[PDB]
Amino acid sequence: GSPYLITGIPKDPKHPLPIRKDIDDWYLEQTSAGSNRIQLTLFVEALTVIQNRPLNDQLSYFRLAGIHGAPWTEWDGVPTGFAVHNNYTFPTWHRVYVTLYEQVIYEAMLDFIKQNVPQNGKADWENEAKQWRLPYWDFARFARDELRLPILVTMPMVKVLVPGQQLSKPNPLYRFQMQTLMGTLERPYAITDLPFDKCQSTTKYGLLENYNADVWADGGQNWLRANLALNEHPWYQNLDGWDSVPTLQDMTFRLLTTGGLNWGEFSSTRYDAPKNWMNLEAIHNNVHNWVGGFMFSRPGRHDLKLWGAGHMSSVPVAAYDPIFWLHHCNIDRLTAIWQTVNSGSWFNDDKSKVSKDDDLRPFHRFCEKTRKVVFFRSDDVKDWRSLNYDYAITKDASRIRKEISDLYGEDYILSIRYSRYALGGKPFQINIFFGDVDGKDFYDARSQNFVGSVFNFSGQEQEGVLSVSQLPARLAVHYYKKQNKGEVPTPRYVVVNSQGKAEAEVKVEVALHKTYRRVADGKRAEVDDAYRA
């Protein structure tokens, strides 16, 4: 049935603008309030059916994930993937993509009810399906002292109700598992420096060099290691007994509360000022890295192994991990929040205006004005409510500033300008330090003097185009001055590849700014010979 018309869940008067809930709040409601976990059952059962549909079914989990990147085939009659990255339509392309997923799941819930619920209970189960929306993962909220992956994502199994008659079933949010290695799928669907061709299941930090290749078939879900990455902060805050602040929460707070940005500044890493370089896509890029892992190996000798790679860090395959959609649900929510407090800023600066009318292929919609099938466009989804969902935080804009502070609440900042194609398109991580760099340990918050990272979510650039990100630096500069006779630090950086080696030929523009004036220029730090690319 093509074209598939994306609409959002249809309107029903008994269900006015239902909200997409925080997935932890929702999980707790469903399992705690009492035993009637009907929405949890519906989502589990429907997503399981979708994951088990065949590859020639374009509404299969695999084909839905395939729209984003590999294996780069057609979708819905529409012949680098469809996904928009490093352009101003990044938020709107993904807004439609998340709505497509939600709609397909709702439709499969209705099918589950027709299949498994007795007549006399159908109205009760239909009511719950019509009230459900895709929950979001609030990656910047403290879990019910630290940031965490959703409760439900960390559960291999989940208890469900059996209509008419609980029962434990594999949790389709934990992983996506195929019946064979993805590199051996039928043409044209096969997925063929990270061994994704040798995976049967999606994995978080599961792929490491120097283990039997059969381990890569399912490398597991190292959610504790992802939670550690998610709470990245400067190294000094782990010292006895300084308090820590997760950089991701600070970045999210600043993104939502800094005023003045135009749509082009907010929407994307694309650079075609530095104070306005904290953008939605850059934060989204670091979260992809922190959930999945991107380093397959590390040089040298190490007892504790903190590396390991996984689907969410890799553009061509990230959409196969079920948390992809929950991450993007919150990116949609952050967009809606920022729209609410920046209500005039929508593709109307000189750089982003050109992209406003881009067709958001491959997504189809019917137009009422021509009674014609057309592609989605950004203006079609400016009001997300037109798609019949909302967020609690935007339903009531009156004290939105208060909820933002309640949730995520001289200045110094780091600016970072880079090419996504500095390594021919391969991903890399830009790590910044204040002070001497350890030539064998230049990786993460456990690395001496580490301040923060910028992840290049990629896998030549458009001429004239680069990418930007921004890191908070106030707390780290204060510590460094204290330790270093009041010296303002020279930012040192290392560009790290998926083998954990430093790429010395890569030039990145790193600078320190203070309230903003430029006070120090970044320099590349050298590492040990053995750790050099």
Annotated binding-site residue numbers for Cu(2+): 68, 85, 94, 284, 288, 328
Closest CB 318 distance from ligand [O-][O-], rounded Å:
6
Residues followed by a gap in the chain, C→N > 2.5 Å? 79, 144, 165, 192, 272, 409, 459, 515
Residue partners of 260: CB distance under 8 A and separation at least 6? 276
Q: Does 240 bind a second copy (CB under 8 A)?
A: yes
CA 459 vs CA 70, 206, 207, 421: distances in Å:
10, 19, 17, 9
Q: C-alpha distances in angstroms, 102 versus 88, 160, 325?
A: 23, 20, 9
CB 8 within 8 A of CB 388: yes
The β-bridge relationship of strands 492-496 and 523-524 is parallel
- Minimum CB distance to Cu ion, residue 73 (Å): 17
Token readout for 252 is 């999210």
Q: Name the binding residues.
A: 68, 85, 94, 284, 288, 328
* Percent of residues in the chain assigned helix, strand, coil, to nearest 5: 35, 15, 50
Q: Which is nearer to ligand [O-][O-], 20 or 311 (CB)?
A: 311
* Separation CA 264–CA 356 (nearest Å): 11
Counting contacts by CB under 8 A, is residue 231 touching a second copy? yes
User: Is residue 100 close enough to count as binding ligand [O-][O-] by CB under 6 A?
Assistant: no
- How many helices (H) and strands (E) in the chain? 13, 15
Stretch that binds a second copy, among 219-227, 310-318, 359-367, 515-523 (CB under 8 A): 219-227
Could you say which of a second copy, ligand [O-][O-], Cu ion, none residue 157 binds, taking C-beta under 5 to 8 angstroms by partner kind? a second copy
Closer residue to a second copy in complex, CB, 113/502: 502
Q: Tell me which residues in 244-273 interact with a second copy (CB under 8 A).
A: 244
Binding site for Cu ion (CB under 5 A): 83
**Nearer of residues 290 and 433 to Cu ion, judged by Cβ:** 290
Nearer Cβ to a second copy, position 40 or 430?
40
Q: Mask 11-40, x = binds a second copy (CB under 8 A)?
A: ----------------xx--x---------
Retrieve residue 17's tokens. 């603008």
Using CB under 8 A as the binding rule, whether residue 476 contacts a second copy is answered as no
Told to check if 228 binds a second copy by CB under 8 A, we report yes
Q: How far is the CB of 491 from a second copy (least distance, A)?
A: 23
Q: Is the dihedral of CA 395, 400, 403, 409 positive or negative?
A: positive
Burial of 180: CB neighbours in 10 Å, binned 0-12, 13-18, 19+: exposed
Phi, psi dihedral angles at 416 (to 5 degrees): -135, 120
Residue 83 CB, shortest distance to Cu ion, in Å, is 4
**Closer residue to Cu ion in complex, CB, 83/407:** 83
Cβ closest to a second copy, residue 303 vs residue 350: 303
**Residues contacting a second copy: total by CB under 8 A:** 43
User: Measured between alpha carbons, how far is 128 from 113 in angstroms, rounded to an integer?
Assistant: 11
Q: Is 142 in the site for a second copy (CB under 8 A)?
A: no
Q: Is residue 318 part of the contact set for ligand [O-][O-] (CB under 6 A)?
A: yes
Binding a second copy (rule: CB under 8 A), the pick from 17, 123, 157, 367 is: 157
Q: Does 303 bind a second copy (CB under 8 A)?
A: yes
Q: How far is CA 468 from CA 14, 256, 353, in A?
A: 45, 18, 19
Closer residue to ligand [O-][O-], CB minimum distance, 317 or 422: 317
Please report whether residue 238 would count as binding a second copy according to CB under 8 A: yes
Q: Tell me which residues in 418-447 interact with a second copy (CB under 8 A).
A: 440, 445-446
Told to check if 448 binds a second copy by CB under 8 A, we report no
**Nearer Cβ to a second copy (237/257):** 237
Binds a second copy (CB under 8 A): choice among 155, 190, 341, 519: 155
Q: What is the dihedral of CA 225, 231, 235, 237, to 10 degrees?
A: -130
Q: Which does 301 bind (CB under 5 to 8 A by kind): Cu ion, a second copy, ligand [O-][O-], none?
A: a second copy
Q: Residue 171, by phi and psi: left (phi above 0), alpha (psi -120 to 50) or beta?
A: beta
The residue among 30 and 289 lying less far from Cu ion, judged by its C-beta, is 289
Residue type, 245: V
Q: CA 378, CA 363: separation in Å to the nearest integer?
A: 11
Phi, psi of 390 (to 5 degrees): -150, 180
Contacts of 406 (CB under 8 A, 6+ apart): none
Using CB under 6 A as the binding rule, whether residue 323 contacts ligand [O-][O-] is answered as: no
Q: Which residues bind a second copy (CB under 8 A)?
A: 27-28, 31, 145-146, 151, 154-157, 167-168, 177, 179-180, 200-201, 208, 211-212, 214-215, 217-218, 220-224, 228, 231, 233, 238, 240, 244, 301, 303-305, 308, 440, 445-446
Q: Which residues bind ligand [O-][O-] (CB under 6 A)?
A: 85, 318
